[PDB]
């Protein structure tokens, strides 16, 4: 038992919920909660601006001192940083951007990332700004992820595609 509500169970380990992942953090403090990272962890808008916010910065400032040690991350690649006050640990991933060309294929290793952790709140890698279409997004995920995963789907009228077409 977990403190997560409401969500829809799509799967054995697979559960998703129309909500803004900063309010779902801020509200449960889940032990993970993953960003939708860039491989600089520049954080300037969707869910990384948006728990960067949340933050007041930290986040940002941590994330560069992380880069100046370690140079940026892969695409499809991870790192575990701090939650700050909104989760023990913040999983950042990075899923392809579409709109830069970048192999739709790498969002299969990017969900990878998510089985290093029993359980996470995330939100559908590679959706929104990053250009792909959270459908496939959350067939990957389900044929990906073996561990629990919570996700929220900002998006209402996306969700209620995302749950209505399910297979
Ligand atoms: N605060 C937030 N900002 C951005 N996104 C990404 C996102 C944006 C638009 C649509 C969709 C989707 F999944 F519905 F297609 C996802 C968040 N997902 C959860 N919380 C989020």
């Given at each position: 038992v977990n403190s997560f509500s409401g969500y829809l169970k799509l799967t054995d380990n697979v559960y998703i919920k129309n909500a803004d992942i900063v309010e779902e953090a801020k509200k449960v403090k889940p032990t993970v909660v993953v960003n939708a990272a860039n491989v600089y962890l520049k954080?300037?808008?969707?869910v990384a601006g948006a728990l960067n916010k949340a933050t007041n910065n930290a986040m940002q400032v941590e994330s560069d001192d992380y880069i100046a040690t370690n140079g940026p991350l892969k695409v499809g690649g991870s790192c575990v940083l701090s939650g700050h006050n909104?989760?023990?640990?913040?999983?950042?991933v990075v899923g392809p951007n579409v709109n830069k060309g970048?192999?739709?294929?790498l969002l299969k290793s990017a969900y990878e990332?998510?089985?290093?952790?029993?359980?996470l709140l995330a939100?559908?890698?590679?959706?929104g700004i990053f250009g792909a279409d959270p459908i496939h997004s959350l067939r990957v995920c389900v044929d990906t992820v073996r561990t629990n995963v919570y996700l929220a789907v900002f998006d209402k009228n996306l969700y209620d595609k995302l749950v209505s077409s399910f297979l």
């Open positions: 954080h300037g808008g969707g909104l989760a023990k640990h913040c999983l950042h970048e192999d739709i294929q990332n998510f089985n290093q952790h029993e359980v939100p559908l890698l590679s959706a």
